Design a protein around this ligand. Sequence first.
Ligand SMILES: Nc1ncnc2c1ncn2[C@@H]1O[C@H](COP(=O)(O)OP(=O)(O)OP(=O)(O)O)[C@@H](O)[C@H]1O
Ligand SMILES: Nc1ncnc2c1ncn2[C@@H]1O[C@H](COP(=O)(O)OP(=O)(O)OP(=O)(O)O)[C@@H](O)[C@H]1O
Ligand SMILES: [Mg+2]
Lengths: 253, 257
Amino acid sequence: IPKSHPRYWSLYYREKIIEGMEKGMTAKAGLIAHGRGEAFDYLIGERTIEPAERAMRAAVAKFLLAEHPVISVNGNVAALVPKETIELAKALNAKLEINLFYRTEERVRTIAEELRKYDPEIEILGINPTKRIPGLEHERGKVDENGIWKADVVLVPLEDGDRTEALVRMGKFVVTVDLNPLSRSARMADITIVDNIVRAYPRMVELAREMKDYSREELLKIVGEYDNGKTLSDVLLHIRDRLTRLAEEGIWR
Amino acid sequence: IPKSHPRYWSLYYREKIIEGMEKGMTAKAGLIAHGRGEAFDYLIGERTIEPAERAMRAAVAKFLLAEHPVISVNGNVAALVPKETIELAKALNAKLEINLFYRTEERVRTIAEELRKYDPEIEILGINPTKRIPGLEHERGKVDENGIWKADVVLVPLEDGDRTEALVRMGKFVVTVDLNPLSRSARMADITIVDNIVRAYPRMVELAREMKDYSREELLKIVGEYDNGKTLSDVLLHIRDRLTRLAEEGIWRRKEL
Ligand SMILES: Nc1ncnc2c1ncn2[C@@H]1O[C@H](COP(=O)(O)OP(=O)(O)OP(=O)(O)O)[C@@H](O)[C@H]1O
Ligand SMILES: Nc1ncnc2c1ncn2[C@@H]1O[C@H](COP(=O)(O)OP(=O)(O)OP(=O)(O)O)[C@@H](O)[C@H]1O
Ligand SMILES: [Mg+2]
């Protein structure tokens, strides 16, 4: 399709998610999840909205003040932002852990190989996790002692509500990127970024540098003031107004 | 999936659509599409709202008054409501036609076999459609000559706008099941049922049996007063008020909506 196609990027990223499945990284359930992401993205406007920028500033602040920052990676992340998830882990000095709900050997390997394609030297935790998140079935709650297990601040993007929830109960401060503000994961996380992860990861990286040197007292003012409930509400309000406008345009009969 | 799970029904149908692709009936793109429907189902509340019940009564009435109704069947319909689609067709005296966006012989065959598991002798059209619906991709515009090609009323659920619109330009009265009330398909169709096909179909089969005796008079009064445009806006209003309410009440850490 021509570069001017209004569906240009979502189409571009869709092939990417399919290539993901082809590479054995992205699970079938992943394609379904991607579609949900697409629809929601169409609704918010395929751009980072103010409530998302707001939550991202707060999440970055929180990661810089963190003690053991950990960025989680699953099959979709690997298909969409392999390079950006690494850059983000460095800009935040957080470690990288592959963490799958539907964990298999090939999938962990392929995702591992995919990340390396961009940095053959990054430490990738999660190849053989020993620990478990309490409240989850064994095979779905694995976590590596050096990563999530010891983490205080965690970023689990595109995550399932059971895991997000078990993580909060476990005492971890949870940050996620999720285009569905109505999902359990989005509603349970401590900081929810409602934005397409292809836009949020590079943005959080930019915000990383822009905040690189901030008075710890400032980084603390930022997070201390952030209101995830207010954020969710504004996102729901954003979507509604969008629905009012969208319904007023396009082909009809 | 334990039935006690808060998201049992959501997960159940995700498994079904996945087992559909594996059984060769459902395409990969169909998995994404199922996901798109889910996004809209969330906005609606994952239930049958009034404006859906309304559109469905009209559709059934229209199908009962038709003389050459046809019900389409794609990979998603085949994996999610194989039995209800057959029930509905027979409760509406409509013919069944297999229609896919990504057509192949293995896919047509498997969708064919799945329907049989519910009726070993059910008639199935679209096996090798030969009529080219003009103004479309040859690859995705061929219909069955004894099916859609001569139908007066057609039901094409989870349809792409290009097909839904082309059929309208074909002079076919079109009914559809589409969770996105803003979709081109939802806008070009004569009667749009904004509801999940796993809820709408069995609900429509109910109506086709409870309406089988409605007088021509009553049925014509229904199809006659129906207003797709008003029904779509009614759907958007439901959603916008739900969003307003949730926003005001707040949803962070909220378990139940
Ligand atoms: N490309 C993407 N960018 C951002 N977010 C995404 C993307 N793809 C999927 N998501 C989000 O991740 C979720 C997909 O995972 P999952 O299937 O667990 O969702 P869900 O089950 O509906 O939510 P929950 O598990 O909280 O009930 C979706 O809710 C969607 O909002
Ligand atoms: N399980 C389901 N139940 C009800 N409706 C569904 C389901 N899955 C998908 N749909 C609807 O069918 C459509 C699938 O087709 P597709 O997504 O290709 O069309 P679209 O490009 O999103 O919209 P359009 O092509 O009409 O502009 C979706 O718009 C969705 O609203
Ligand atoms: Mg889930």
